[model samples]
Target: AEEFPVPNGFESAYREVDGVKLHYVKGGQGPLVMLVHGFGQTWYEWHQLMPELAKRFTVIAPDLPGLGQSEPPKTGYSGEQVAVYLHKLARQFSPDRPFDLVAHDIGIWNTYPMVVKNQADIARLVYMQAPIPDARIYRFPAFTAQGESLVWHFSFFAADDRLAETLIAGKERFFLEHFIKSHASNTEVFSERLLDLYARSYAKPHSLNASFEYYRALNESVRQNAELAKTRLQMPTMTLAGGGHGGMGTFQLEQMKAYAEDVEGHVLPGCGHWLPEECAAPMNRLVIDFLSRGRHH
Candidate 1:
């Protein structure tokens, strides 16, 4: 059994797809709501919001490939490849119905290809803190401490395997904790107990390599996103960022409009990158409202 499990009443399952074992939590009983998490997190990231979401829609939150309980593939971790994996997961769980997607961090990158090509199977999309599939040439505002903090790690994580792995291998706890603290407005949300759980998963053999693979594939993601941007998405979409630590804030909505025809953006006040955990109240409320609105639209 993996360390990350669903909340009480929700059941867990693993589907063997290609070389990856996708671990996901499923419960509730209406339209399927697929929750995909980003780096440094597991399906557990959405635990706080699931109960409420489940009240109205079935929720499926997965530990995406190369993270959490899911095993990494031998090579393919590109955005498109991750999308293929997610498509397979969607087929297995909600074969006959289109599902809504709520993706964060790297999860948004993975969902881009799937949503673009398989738009028929996705009813709506909610993205948080990811810069993919919106390929407009938007310049970063004048260099600020916030901008530096948000992006300095991209190159570090994308560096050659040896250099990146060496710096992260033994110091998993410090690295993960620092990441959470630096990006979170309410640092107390990521309790020591929570950090320990994340460190344990990341400390696993080959985990660091798997996580970095997503960063290594950014060039491919950029190329694909540019192509995807040519076709605007018609589905209702929403982009969110934390006003405090969510550097992009409503700017994400602008980027999103370049790809999605009907899109809205929000910046959770006093929140940070860890939206699901840090801003659970607003996150849950807004997500529920957005998704509910989608069904009627």
Candidate 2:
């Protein structure tokens, strides 16, 4: 367990919980707010938006186990493991005070269980383009039926360290190129410098394997979601979307409502999956409005 050197944008601190070192960034002075990123991304994904968010609240964002500056493991990781990891993280920050929670992509998968198990620990929740699949309907992608023959199997980042190391080392440029082009929508959206960060980070000896462990944890995610399905959230909640062509539309709103007693949602006009960067103004305004709801002026 080790704390990586702090970067320029934000000062960093790390704590080892459950044998893995967790890294979190700290900025601002008011109520502590924590943010998590989905797969294929790092905490840096929130760079453009965090400055505004830091104005009113203490902003803390961390790279999850496999992706960022954090260390990797020999075994695989799952959503349930991440949930437990974050629960310990939450406790270390402010065990008694409920903090604001925000997450994007697969980050939500790891966070959902924390709120379910400890309803009193969060003040509000902001979930971005991620899925809370109707468990009954969720199934592995089509080619999955072929078992080990699936090409995406390795790409999804779901193997033990050894296998992940080989896949990543096999064609490093191939993976990094796709990350900036396909998911980020070109160099302008992801930028050469930003893409370089991912490439450099993953270049580390163990980084590749750590990333693969993330997908291996899906079974645990299913198990945890089932456990969470029975408990409804009581805190304030909001869901926002960029209307990314593939992201769940109204269905996201419906499940969020069903999962939590109080929740609201909206879509950003003319936007895609990259919400925080592409549409900062509207997204910030939406967030400010949601956080201010029912609060004394």
Candidate 3:
């Protein structure tokens, strides 16, 4: 908790929900906002974005089950299950009002179901830096060298289920560091200290295996996403893409266009997959300026 620091006024807490011990850091007041981090990162990913957003609205960044300090889920790792647990968690915090969501990477996969099923519960949504595991994922060509480096993990993770864990056992740091570094355009942002923290989490007993559960759950997510995508979002939406190497670029924007009616976003310069950290300044400004519509509108 002290490494990145919990943004001064925020407090770290945990609650046992859906058979998993979910953890989060939260503070500030007024309408609620939930930050959902994707794979390779945790609630800590929002360490920068949370504090700033806290000034005006209540902000909560919860570790997805099986990542960070949270425990592995008992039900399963499918998007539908994750969404149920997460939605219940969000509702408990701001029972009286609709909340805003900012989800990144695989976090998009997890939260899209929540937003789709409970459209009335969300005021606005900001999905950043990744594509949902819809049928489009199958279009990623692995025959070429560039495509292989970018997507080889998809098949590897969803491979025989235990294969990723078997190979990644003692090499958690190398595996995670490679993934993080390869995707991030701003490599300097992820210092050794930060990398070690993530490594340490995956080193936990079941954390490594649970992390793969997200990828392994993609088949079901693809099905769920296709169904969910049918309902275009009515709330304001923002998509922020990274323009640098290995980033989603405007592709994420195009994906969002298919899912929302009020879609608007930007392809950030020199930013890769890590938007909240790599492009925190502009990303922060974009989020605050964008979501302010929910606050003051």
Candidate 4:
């Protein structure tokens, strides 16, 4: 995969958490803040917000296992397993102090369990762009184009029969570019250079296969999330949404509100699914202000 340069004060590194060798970039100082990326992108998604936030916090953004440069979690791909690795990553860094979490897309699906289960280890959470697997996904009509088109890839990517891989093979760029662009209302930031980089990353042997493993276990992940939701997140939680085409505008806030005890959020006007990339400036400021002090401010 071609290199995407890290901002000043950032260094790319790796950590072996529970046998999964995770790749991440870390920088800055003060309280720990972990940025978890969603699909079709890696820690590179936070390229714009990292340096700005790093000035006030220690930021660590890691590619989800099997998605970017990280090794595959062949043991399992459910949220329970993936979230544990991330929680442990933060634990190892802070040890004695609580840490903040920021997740986007399936990053929320993968990390939701962690926040719910380890209430004390986490101090604040920022979940954006995607829905945590619950009864909500099933509420949509199975064969209706309106329902399917909204989240067409959910079923496609979750097929464990190897069909998705067979179709996407040798066409990583086409598929990933289509996937990213389809949801982004703002596309200029996802430039040809970055798109090609993502294509190259998934083009690597097993990278595409590794990426799909998480979806294959969506059912199990959803079950775990439901079980964990019994313990609602008590930490200060903030949800963000894009109010433009294909955006989850207020969807995240509404869904998360039911599952969380203390949560607050807003819809970014004219923004799309890729909140970190589509609305980097406002997103950065919102997060910094939220984390800089208590939630009531």
Candidate 5:
């Protein structure tokens, strides 16, 4: 965790909650905006966009438990449980005021339960490249054009912990680069330097297994979201799908609309799953407009 330098302009610290220290980067000052990163990423995923966002809003991005600087808990990785940690962190910052939320990949998964239990605390939400929780129709890609190749990492990660740990231990660079390049529409967006940064953090002793825990808990997450879907989300919601790796695209919007009263969706042309990295300019514009609307604070 200490190996990765904190980005310029952001103050880094760890907030202790529920016996775990959560690593976070905070900058600027205005309405709170929480940026949540997904698998194969950390708070650093949002570093490039933080400066612009900080100008208009107080920005806080945290590495999900066990993924980066944040230490791993004894147990608990289900979305519902992860949401508890997130809500606690939010309360630490703004006990009374609602904050805008932005999440991608696994971050989106964890944010689902947070929004369900505490919608009043979030002014708006922007979900990127992750499926709407508990949607009956959502299906992870099983195989590419080639029949043997699996698309999503769910099955791989859900395998026996010892086996998955062994396979990923020494191949951190290969594993991270493969997923980044494979899902990205513009592979060139991830330079060697950027890849090395991610690989360094992921290469740590327990980092790989800790990350796999999120995927292992998918079944529990599904059950929890199914119950949560019985009641719809009333806050303003937007879904960003990349035409390349964003398999669901407008379909993600459609599913979200079923559970969220106010919903909007857009597909980034020629973009892939890594929205923040592959498509920052348009992504930032859309996020700012949506989050800034109807809320001057």
Candidate 6:
């Protein structure tokens, strides 16, 4: 894959965690803040959020295991796998300190299980643009029914190696298009250069298959969920919604009440699928403020 120039003050780091070489970016100093990106994008999604987050805390943003510049694991690159790796990554970054976590899209879906299950000395959590699984919150039929149109990754996940390559390779541009357009606020932000970044990253051999595996790994998240079912997240939590889509509206707030002791949420106006890029500064301030409040009292 071509190496696009990383923005200034941002350095890429890679580590072998849970059989995958996870690629992430780290900058600034002070409290540790980890940024977890969602689907079809890399650490680049958090580009706008970094500077503000860095002012108050050391920010570490990752491209996720299968997505960005990272290499995916062959047998077990599921959501649960991601959690384990992130837990380890957190420790590696700050051996004596546990950091705050911020996750977007499927990254939240994956990160929740880890945070809930491991409770990894995590300080607090900020989940954006993803739903925590609960029958009450999500309308499964709406998602399963869409199948190829809505949940193409579900089918993609089930495909064998040869088939996965053919379908993904054949429709690379189409996939990129959907990724860019899905986010309402970011519709105008999807420039040709940005599309190229995603297209080229995905076009790499096995990259598509690895991404599919991340989707397929939802089953593992289910397993993790089962383990987490026994306990609610005791830490303070903040959830944000963009465009009020999916199980992301007020209903999600009610649902969060079940799994968390304390949680708050808001719908950012004019924002859509991608929260980090859609409105990074406000989001960053909201998160940093939330985390810092916990420290003071």
The most accurate candidate by TM-score is: 3
RMSD of 4: 2.3
- In model 3, the runs with Cα more than 4 Å from the true position are 1-4, 143-148
lDDT of 2 at 126: 92
lDDT of 5 by residue, 1-297 (tens): 364676678899899879888889998788889999988889988887788888888889988999888877655988998888888897788788998899998897888898888889988999888765564524645676744332456777877746677888888998889878878887798998989999988777777878888878888898888888888888999888888753346766877788789988999887888888898888888888888894544
lDDT of 1 by residue, 47-75 (tens): 88887888888888888887777878645
| lDDT top scorer | 3
lDDT of 2 by residue, 1-297 (tens): 322333445677777877888777777656767888876567877776677777677778887876676655323466656777877786777676778888887788778878788888888899987666336324425343434321244335655556756766856656776643443321356666666666776666666665665666665677768877887889989997766433345655766887888888987765555677666788778876666553212
lDDT of each: 0.82, 0.67, 0.85, 0.83, 0.82, 0.70
TM-scores of all models? 0.93, 0.82, 0.95, 0.94, 0.94, 0.86
Candidate 2 local Cα displacement, residue 147, angstroms? 22
For model 1, how many clashes?
0
Candidate 4, pairs of clashing residues: none
Candidate 6 structure quality by residue, lDDT tens digits, 158-262: 556656667668688777777557545657667777788778877766667666766566666666676776798988888888652222445445667778888
For model 5 the local lDDT of residue 64 reads 91
Off by over 4 Å in 2: 1-9, 73-76, 133-156, 159-165, 184-187, 294-297
lDDT of 5: 0.82
